[PDB]
Design an enzyme around this catalytic site. Structure first.
Site, PDB file in Angstrom:
ATOM      1  N   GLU A   5      16.506  64.674   8.165  1.00 33.41           N
ATOM      2  CA  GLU A   5      15.963  65.596   6.813  1.00 33.41           C
ATOM      3  C   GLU A   5      15.041  64.645   6.036  1.00 33.41           C
ATOM      4  O   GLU A   5      14.218  64.047   6.667  1.00 33.41           O
ATOM      5  CB  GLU A   5      17.221  66.196   5.944  1.00 33.41           C
ATOM      6  CG  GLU A   5      17.698  67.335   6.793  1.00 33.41           C
ATOM      7  CD  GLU A   5      16.933  68.542   7.176  1.00 33.41           C
ATOM      8  OE1 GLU A   5      16.343  68.529   8.114  1.00 33.41           O
ATOM      9  OE2 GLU A   5      16.914  69.446   6.079  1.00 33.41           O
ATOM     10  N   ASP A   6      15.521  64.312   4.541  1.00 28.54           N
ATOM     11  CA  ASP A   6      14.580  63.413   3.792  1.00 28.54           C
ATOM     12  C   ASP A   6      15.179  62.111   3.471  1.00 28.54           C
ATOM     13  O   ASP A   6      14.725  61.396   3.026  1.00 28.54           O
ATOM     14  CB  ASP A   6      14.095  64.210   2.526  1.00 28.54           C
ATOM     15  CG  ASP A   6      13.304  65.355   3.159  1.00 28.54           C
ATOM     16  OD1 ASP A   6      13.530  66.261   4.048  1.00 28.54           O
ATOM     17  OD2 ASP A   6      12.421  65.650   2.029  1.00 28.54           O
TER      18      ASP A   6
END
Ligand SMILES: [Mg+2]
Ligand SMILES: [Zn+2]
Ligand SMILES: [Zn+2]
Ligand SMILES: [Zn+2]
Ligand SMILES: [Zn+2]
Lengths: 34, 42, 44, 49, 528, 98, 257, 48, 115, 526, 67
Positions: free
Chosen positions: J204-205
């Site tokens: 994800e981030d």
RNA sequence: AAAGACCAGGC
């Protein structure tokens, strides 16, 4: 008397002169002074 | 966003509330006879 | 109780329930003179 | 800010060099709160005599 | 007034009866953890120490619960309160309390949350029922919740400042109910669209795509290392696809061990051309596209979002339907672990070299852009001298705008196709797009070839000033540059006018995201 | 004496006006501090410029459902000397018969 | 089923750097020796810091953190010194720690640089790598700094302050012949320092039967342990860990059988 | 619908109120289902 | 506040055993080695030294979770050759290899300095 | 125009507009108009000549400044509705010189196009290579970047003062950041960033931080919290006083520790204080005594930095106490680049575990490559490449938005001149097994900034704590030990589960339970 | 604030190389040559000195709390 | 400190 191919220096020189003269909160300072 | 019809959330709102005046009320029409195929009668 | 001043930095002795007034400086702001008890700091 | 009118919130052509296009808060205040450009200056006022 | 107290949100009925603040609830930041199971959630030690689950002492568990009581509230695996039969509550936080540590059957001891406990995990822009699912507790160090990345999709969460609620059921009845109704494996397939909601996503998906190809071959030690992360492995090393001169396994051969039971499924890779099914090599697939899984073994093909992703008829959907939730959970976890640990070998990245095409491709893109500009200039000139006939149902301005939009869209599509045709098989943008993990073809087009036309309110950039878009342009200039068509790409960098027009274009998406959410939520509340 | 007016920091009437870097450091003030904010009860308060329609000019707007087809208005104020604003509308009565 | 015989040649050996090549050995042993360079090598660094007076513009634990990262010469007495956890005495004793004393007050108007030179140790063997000067904090006139610190024995696993080495450059197969990494365009990749092929060609031809060997090393010491002592203590520590594992395994096997 | 040569069986409108006033309540059921399906599956999404 | 102490990757506190052997019931003569408070530095070392043994059919190491400090090593050998004996032989092999390497490095350093 | 240029009668602020088509001339002297300076063009040549730049180069000790430049008729302040009647040139060297004729009636030229960006958006390196929403995100996020916010922070005692240890001026900088005073007060630090998927903990981030670097002070910061207190006299005999309460002199008393207080009820700086510790000893004389002392917020575990006592406006004794707690970046802290690439710390690997280059370089932060392709941060990659080339060359990279003289190809060639791969990719070795990673990882120093949002200040846990006075329900907020809210959407989602008694527990048992006695004849309580 | 010793990426000592770097910059050398003369070959080390800003000088301007 | 308002900010 012109500035060809030397524009990158000159534009930032005049921008630096502006920001040294005025600043960032010059609008606030001028409004309160008025 | 040349027929334009409301889609997405506003159209879903219109359907859910059954708005008495939809933003873009449209009525598709089909033709029975030769007008269906021939352009002049259409 | 010893407070050190914020302008002249000369320590003055002042108890509790007395007004805050720096001697020979005329300042109203006092400081707490970091304590004597010693804490252990890890080097991490 | 509660207003759903999406027109005032839009970035206008009129903001070129005047207000920063990229910088704006996020949430209900997007576009409605704008921060000044670097060179932007506000007129302070003058008597028109 | 009383009417103001009995009102909508924050009122009595909506704010204190339909919804209310609850005891036994914890919230903190979330953090990815591929090593956890699908139904497992990482819980910090402090939260588990504060959180308590009431337990009833029986002769079966009197010794363990007495030990927990003796540990007290200081050591983590302990109890905070003891509740006797008469309902008086005894606190173990204050003083040792040696006379009250006695336990007899019928008492309630409030032990700290331990591994294997059942909790409800919530992120609360709760749109569907999968935004709140029951999880299994595993205690981890540090201070963040941790959850598997396939579980990311149902919660719509992304690990950047996200926070999730943790509800701990306090009774055996509700704990069993959450276990048998709301567990993450039990909710793989949605009733909304009869598809799986969880899917192999992002890093594990890209590595699956890179690992499923014919090209990959794994040596002995790599095969062993990958095999041990397979929880359901039977312990028999499969015979390698290549035996001589040296034993080399294949990515499909090892992946077939992950597939549970005997699953039969046929899919197609994103690259799959439509010419293959018509002519020869229909079952040979020269590009090794399409997917055939026969008797639970991956015979051929490349896996991507079309196979392991969240779609109808996907391989994971077949696994859930044919086998069951419990085995599909292990299938998810084994895929995640083994594929991440193989990417530890191969590696994935993105870089500047992945965002640039060949010089011939740049020349072709520039020629296409020049041709498009010439065509739109010719159209503008033709409309100027009134040779443009109005299309029926449209004014001359409408037809002119339609022609310009068609020209620009065709140019952008052609440039995007040319750019994507120039990407090598090693290009990471293409690797991400074909896998379906993230990105799309238009994304590569914008990065490499042309950003494209910028639209405000569904139309080309309007004339904010007096019959001109920006002061740098002449009045009544309908050309592509003046009206917001960005010739440059992100790699090349936008010109200042193009930069401002792109800012205007992105402001549209920002405003839509910020403003549609309230009305969508109100619609959901009304429907509910 | 009729009252006290808060003074914007580093303005002309502030005590920090015209002071060099060393003078500001002797005052325990940051030389890089731009100023432009008020100190009210110890807290630092900054006035944010508020947008509004330009005064004394003529504008023409068209509402979709109002009884006016075209509406002209002039938000008028007198040199800002007194009164907030007195605004006047001049409009055209659509098409429906009166 | 037995050891291959490793050979070592030392190319460059300075007071801050040692460059050696390990041949006829396995990839995993080379990698573990590389990791022990950073993690498992014992070293003496300041851990216990007590500050009596701190007038500097940097707060207490800031200067404590800066002190902890100061390298200390442990070339000899790091072996005889025992971990404070395993030491019999409570707190610290000379057989488990080294005392450092710092006492600086700035009286002159010019700024005084509190450097590693100002650190005073009770034993002459552990000097903070000063046979320029590592800067701890700067003091203006009137500011003062007095503290007492103890230095313990630790390794890189505990904290990075116990890292004895700078960047350890490890490299095997310089001209890519095993195809462990595939260059999409081999021609644009610079040739390694140890590359043995000609300038015109890019990669060596693929070797299906080859296995990783000739692991090129470059161990740069941080000044605490001289660079050859780092690798020697690394090999000794890895062997000690293996021997302890062997002892525990043997005890477990006898117990379970 | 009353107009000549216009197909009376396939002609329909997107708004629901006039369908209620003209064709009945079950025709409204079907037309509302069609409109919801259109507005949902226009983007390509599917709902059971 | 939940940060574990720095000394949890090498220190063994009260209760845990340094190594643990559990037989694997899925396949014959295969055992599971669980090493507490230890990481890849030796996990890979015994993983690779086992593969040198021709009598070892399966060999490897893994870490169940990086935030925890544990290694699970699974060894499968040929019949009539216990995996425990193979693991012991590999450890002794690595000890001998490291001793020989240390001796050769000392010889090389003596050659390089004033030589 | 001539008079305004020479500033005789009309000041440069006043705006003059000629609407030719409508025959109106509007002259505005009003306050509040927004205006920006612009260069003046006569014919096809600027009025800014070589001598102006020569005099401005020597601006120091010359008394020649921006005001003299404006008074020379070279620059003019043009507001908006006068900008309507103006025709601007982007750059002089391109749009003023003769070419394929587009316009010849240029009257003004922009100083530099990068001046259209604001204070926060000016620090973005290569902002024209980014997606505009990401530029907006980075602009709104830079206000949360952590650093030395002011030089005199030691004397200012304000609540929630975040200060970073080692801020660094960016390797890749914009020309405007000099005028933003960002160099002197940076907020963030350059870091060797590898864009790779290593162990899946950066998915994800999220990002993977180097534990060894973090231990070396990387992204380590300080957290100052201020506590004010007001002694006052309100009642006739009721008064407040600072002092250390004894065990039994006051009626109210909490089980917190009071031994750290001094004779005046104030802890001197340098005393370590953890959660629930008493900061200021304060009591109320009840008309014996009532303890109103203030406690620390739960689990801060900081050290008292500064304690100041003074007199307020009324002259009463006034105390402010600042306590600092150094916070090491954990795996819950939020980190972002200068392009909107925000994310949490996935896991912290030591230097041994992190992948290393052939030179021993190990990335301090590893970010997942999956972030880049969708959200269009190409200026992130270009900034990384420029940082890699600038750290080698020895210059500070120039990332002015619109340069047209700094191509990606130019940076690539400059980097290839230094023995690295021209695209910034570097071959990496696996930290665990030592094997070469088959893919070549993109590595380079990228400016990263630590954010205020940190997990230690966000984690909350509730188990039968305080209840509201009116609703007898769990309190509101993290600071009040309040419980999480089980909103309407929550109960609807649970109804979809068909989880009846879990809902009953959530809304009746976990929250406020109660019993009432209601008559059987009437339905009203009894 | 002050020059951080022990370059974060690798660990090489750079806390003692700030004053020498300032002197080399002030007298003749450019930043690249000054860093090369200080023996900083890995760009992770050169970014520490090159990108460093020294607020410790600004913090020393203010008078100490005690004289 | 209590609930009220306002403000800024995260997803
Ligand atoms: Mg998010
Ligand atoms: Zn004084
Ligand atoms: Zn001792
Ligand atoms: Zn009754
Ligand atoms: Zn370095």
């Amino acid at each position: 008397e012109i500035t060809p191919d030397l524009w990158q220096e000159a534009c930032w020189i005049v921008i630096s002169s502006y920001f040294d003269e005025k600043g960032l909160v010059r609008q606030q300072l001028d409004s309160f002074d008025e | 966003f040349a027929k334009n019809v409301t889609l997405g959330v506003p159209r879903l709102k219109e359907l859910i509330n059954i708005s008495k005046k939809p933003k873009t009320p449209s009525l598709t029409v089909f033709l029975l006879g030769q007008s269906a195929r021939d352009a002049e009668r259409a | 109780m010893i407070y050190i001043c914020g302008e002249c930095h000369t320590e003055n002795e002042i108890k509790s329930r007395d007004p805050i007034r720096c001697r020979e400086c005329g300042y109203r702001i006092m400081y707490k003179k970091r304590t004597k008890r010693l804490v252990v700091f890890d080097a991490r | 800010r509660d207003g759903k009118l999406a027109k005032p919130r839009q970035l206008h052509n009129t903001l070129w060099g005047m207000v920063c296009p990229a910088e704006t808060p996020e949430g209900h205040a997007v576009g409605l709160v704008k921060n000044l450009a670097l060179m932007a200056y506000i007129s302070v006022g003058s008597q028109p005599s | 007034s009383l009417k103001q107290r009995l009102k909508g949100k924050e009122g009595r009925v909506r704010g204190n009866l339909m919804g209310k603040r609850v005891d036994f609830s914890a919230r903190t930041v979330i953090t990815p953890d591929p090593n956890l199971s699908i139904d497992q959630v990482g819980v910090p030690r402090s939260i588990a120490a504060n959180m308590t689950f009431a337990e009833i002492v029986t002769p079966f568990n009197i010794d363990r619960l007495q030990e927990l009581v003796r540990r007290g509230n200081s050591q983590y695996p302990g109890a905070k309160y003891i509740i006797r039969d008469n309902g008086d509550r005894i606190d173990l936080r204050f003083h040792p309390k040696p006379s009250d540590l006695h336990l007899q059957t019928g008492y309630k001891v409030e032990r700290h949350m331990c591994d294997g406990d059942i909790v409800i995990f919530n992120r609360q822009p709760t749109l569907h029922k999968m935004s709140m699912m029951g999880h299994r507790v595993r205690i981890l160090p540090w201070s963040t919740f941790r959850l598997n990345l396939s579980v990311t999709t149902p919660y719509n969460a992304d690990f950047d400042g996200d926070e999730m609620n943790l509800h701990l059921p306090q009774s055996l009845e509700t704990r069993a109910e959450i276990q048998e109704l709301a567990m993450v494996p039990r909710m793989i397939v949605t009733p909304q669209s009869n598809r799986p909601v969880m899917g192999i996503v992002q890093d594990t998906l890209t590595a699956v795509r890179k690992f499923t190809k014919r090209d990959v071959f794994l040596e002995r030690g790599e095969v062993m290392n990958l095999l041990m992360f397979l929880s359901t492995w039977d312990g028999k090393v499969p015979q390698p696809a290549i035996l001589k001169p040296r034993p080399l396994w294949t990515g499909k051969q090892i992946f077939s061990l992950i597939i549970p039971g005997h699953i039969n499924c046929i899919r197609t890779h994103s690259t799959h051309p439509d010419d293959e099914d018509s002519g020869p090599y229909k079952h040979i697939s020269p590009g090794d596209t399409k997917v055939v899984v026969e008797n639970g073994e991956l015979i051929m093909g490349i896996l991507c979002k079309k196979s392991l992703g969240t779609s109808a008829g996907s391989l994971v959907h077949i696994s859930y339907l044919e086998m069951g939730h419990d085995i599909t959970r292990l299938f998810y976890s084994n895929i995640q672990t083994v594929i991440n640990n193989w990417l530890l070998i191969e590696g994935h990245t993105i870089g500047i070299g992945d965002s640039i095409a060949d010089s011939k491709t740049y020349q072709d893109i520039q020629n296409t852009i020049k041709k498009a500009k010439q065509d739109v200039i010719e159209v503008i000139e033709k409309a100027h001298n009134n040779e443009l006939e109005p299309t029926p149902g449209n004014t001359l301005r409408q037809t002119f705008e339609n022609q310009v939009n068609r020209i620009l869209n065709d140019a952008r599509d052609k440039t995007g196709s040319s750019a994507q045709k120039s990407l090598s098989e090693y290009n990471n943008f293409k690797s991400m797009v074909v896998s379906g993990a993230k990105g799309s073809k238009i994304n590569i087009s914008q990065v490499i070839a042309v950003v494209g036309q910028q639209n405000v309110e569904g139309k080309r950039i309007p004339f904010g000033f007096k019959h001109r878009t920006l002061p740098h342009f002449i009045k009544d200039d309908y050309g592509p540059e003046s009206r917001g068509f960005v010739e440059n790409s992100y790699l090349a960098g936008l010109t200042p006018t193009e930069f401002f027009f792109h800012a205007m274009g992105g402001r549209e998406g920002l405003i839509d995201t910020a403003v549609k959410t309230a009305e969508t939520g109100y619609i959901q509340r009304r429907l509910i | 004496f009729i009252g006290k007016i808060p003074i914007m920091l580093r303005s002309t009437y502030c005590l920090l006006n015209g002071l060099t870097d060393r003078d500001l450091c002797e005052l325990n003030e940051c030389p890089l501090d731009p100023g432009g904010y008020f100190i009210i009860n110890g807290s630092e308060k900054v006035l944010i410029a508020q947008e509004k329609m330009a005064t004394n000019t003529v504008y023409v707007f068209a509402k979709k459902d109002s009884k006016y087809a075209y509406t002209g208005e002039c938000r008028s104020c007198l040199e800002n000397s007194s009164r907030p604003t007195s605004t006047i509308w001049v409009s055209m009565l659509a098409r429906g018969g009166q | 089923p037995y050891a291959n015989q490793p050979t070592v040649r030392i190319t460059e050996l300075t007071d801050e750097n040692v460059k050696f090549i390990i041949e006829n050995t396995d990839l995993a042993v080379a990698n573990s020796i590389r990791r022990v360079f950073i993690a498992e090598v014992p070293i003496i660094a300041i851990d216990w810091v007590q500050i009596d007076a701190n007038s500097s513009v940097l707060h207490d634990e800031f200067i404590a953190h800066r002190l902890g990262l100061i390298p200390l010469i442990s070339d000899d007495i790091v072996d005889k010194l025992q971990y404070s956890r395993d030491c019999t005495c409570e707190e610290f004793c000379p057989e488990c720690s080294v005392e450092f004393t710092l006492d600086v007050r700035c009286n002159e108007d010019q700024t005084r640089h509190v450097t590693s030179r100002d650190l005073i140790s009770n034993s002459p063997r552990v000097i903070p790598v000063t046979s320029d000067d590592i800067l701890i904090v700067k003091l203006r006139k009137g500011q003062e700094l007095r503290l007492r610190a103890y230095a313990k024995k630790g390794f890189g696993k505990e904290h990075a302050k116990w890292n004895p080495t700078a960047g350890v450059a490890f490299e095997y197969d310089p001209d890519n012949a095993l195809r462990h990494t595939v260059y999409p365009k081999p021609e644009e990749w610079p040739k390694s320092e140890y590359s043995e092929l000609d300038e015109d060609e890019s990669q060596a031809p693929y070797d299906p039967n080859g296995k990783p060997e000739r692991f090129y090393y470059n161990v740069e010491s941080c000044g605490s342990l001289r660079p050859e002592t780092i690798v020697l203590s690394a090999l000794s520590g890895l062997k000690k860990k293996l021997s302890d594992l062997q002892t525990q395994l043997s005890h477990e096997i006898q117990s379970d059988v | 619908l009353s107009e000549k040569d216009v197909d009376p069986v396939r002609t329909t409108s997107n708004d629901i109120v006039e369908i209620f006033t003209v064709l009945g309540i079950e025709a409204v059921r079907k037309a509302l289902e069609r409109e919801l399906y259109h507005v949902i599956s226009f983007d390509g999404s599917y709902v059971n | 506040m939940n940060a574990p102490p720095a000394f949890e990757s090498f220190l063994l506190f009260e209760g845990e055993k340094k190594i643990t052997i559990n037989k694997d019931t899925k396949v014959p003569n295969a055992c599971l080695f669980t090493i507490n408070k230890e990481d890849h530095t030796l996990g890979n070392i015994i993983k690779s030294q086992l593969l040198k043994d021709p009598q070892v059919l399966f060999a490897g190491y893994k870490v169940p979770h990086p935030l925890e400090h544990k290694i699970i090593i699974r060894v499968q050998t040929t019949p009539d050759y216990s995996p425990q004996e193979a693991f012991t032989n590999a450890i002794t092999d690595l000890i001998s290899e490291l001793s020989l390497l240390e001796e050769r490095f000392r010889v090389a350093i003596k050659d390089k300095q004033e030589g | 125009r001539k008079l305004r240029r020479q500033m005789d009668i009309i000041v440069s602020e006043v705006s003059m507009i000629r609407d030719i088509r409508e025959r109106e001339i509007r002259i505005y002297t009003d306050a509040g108009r927004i205006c920006r300076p612009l260069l003046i063009v006569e014919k096809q040549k600027l009025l800014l000549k070589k001598r102006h730049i020569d005099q401005l180069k020597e601006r120091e000790y010359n008394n020649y400044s921006w005001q003299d430049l404006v008074a020379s008729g070279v620059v003019e302040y043009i507001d908006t509705l006068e900008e309507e009647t103006v025709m601007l040139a982007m750059t002089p060297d391109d749009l003023q010189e003769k070419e394929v004729a587009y316009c010849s009636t240029y009257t003004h030229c922009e100083i530099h196009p990068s001046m259209i960006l604001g204070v926060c958006a000016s620090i973005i390196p290569f902002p024209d290579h980014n997606q505009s929403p990401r530029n907006t995100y980075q602009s709104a996020m830079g206000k949360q970047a952590m650093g030395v916010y002011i030089t005199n922070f030691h004397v200012r005692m304000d609540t929630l003062a975040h200060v970073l240890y080692y801020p660094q001026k960016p390797l890749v900088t914009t020309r405007s950041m000099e005028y933003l005073r960002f160099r002197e007060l940076p907020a963030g630090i350059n870091s060797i960033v590898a864009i790779a998927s290593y162990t899946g903990y950066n998915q994800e981030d999220s990002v993977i931080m180097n534990r060894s670097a973090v231990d070396r002070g990387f992204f380590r910061s300080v957290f100052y919290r201020s506590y004010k207190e007001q002694e006052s006299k309100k009642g006739f005999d009721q008064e407040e006083v600072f002092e250390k309460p004894t065990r039994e002199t006051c009626q109210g008393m909490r089980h917190a520790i009071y031994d750290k207080l001094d004779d005046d009820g104030l802890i001197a700086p340098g005393v370590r204080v953890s959660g629930d510790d008493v900061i200021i000893g304060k009591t109320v004389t009840l008309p014996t005594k009532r303890d109103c002392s203030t406690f620390l917020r739960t689990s801060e575990t900081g050290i008292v930095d500064q304690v100041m006592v003074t007199l307020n406006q009324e002259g009463y004794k006034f105390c402010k106490i600042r306590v600092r707690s150094v916070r090491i970046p954990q795996i819950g802290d939020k980190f972002a680049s200068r392009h909107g690439q925000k994310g949490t710390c996935g896991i912290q690997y030591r230097q041994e575990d992190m992948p290393f280059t052939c030179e021993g370089i190990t990335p301090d932060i590893i970010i997942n490559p999956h972030a880049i392709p969708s959200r269009m941060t190409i200026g992130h990659l270009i900034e990384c490449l420029q940082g890699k080339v600038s750290a080698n060359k020895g210059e500070i990279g120039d990332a002015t938005p619109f340069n047209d003289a700094v191509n990606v190809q130019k940076i690539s060639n400059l980097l290839s001149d230094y023995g690295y791969h021209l695209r910034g990719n570097e071959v990496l070795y696996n930290g665990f097994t030592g094997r070469k990673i088959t893919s070549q990882i993109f590595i380079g120093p990228t400016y990263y900034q630590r954010l205020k949002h940190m997990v230690d200040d966000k984690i909350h846990s509730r188990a039968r704590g305080p209840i509201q006075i009116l609703n007898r329900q769990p309190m509101e907020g993290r600071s009040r030990d309040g419980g999480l809210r089980f909103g309407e959407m929550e109960r609807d989602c649970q109804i979809a589960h068909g989880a009846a008694q879990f809902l009953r527990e959530r809304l009746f048992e976990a929250s406020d339970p109660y019993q009432v006695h209601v008559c059987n004849l009437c339905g009203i309580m009894a | 604030m002050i020059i951080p010793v022990r370059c974060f990426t690798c660990g090489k000592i750079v806390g003692n190389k700030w004053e020498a770097y300032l002197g080399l910059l002030q007298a003749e050398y450019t930043e690249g040559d000054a860093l090369d003369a200080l023996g900083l070959k890995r760009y992770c080390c050169r970014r520490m000195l090159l990108a460093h800003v020294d607020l410790i000088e600004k913090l020393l301007n203010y008078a100490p709390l005690e004289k």
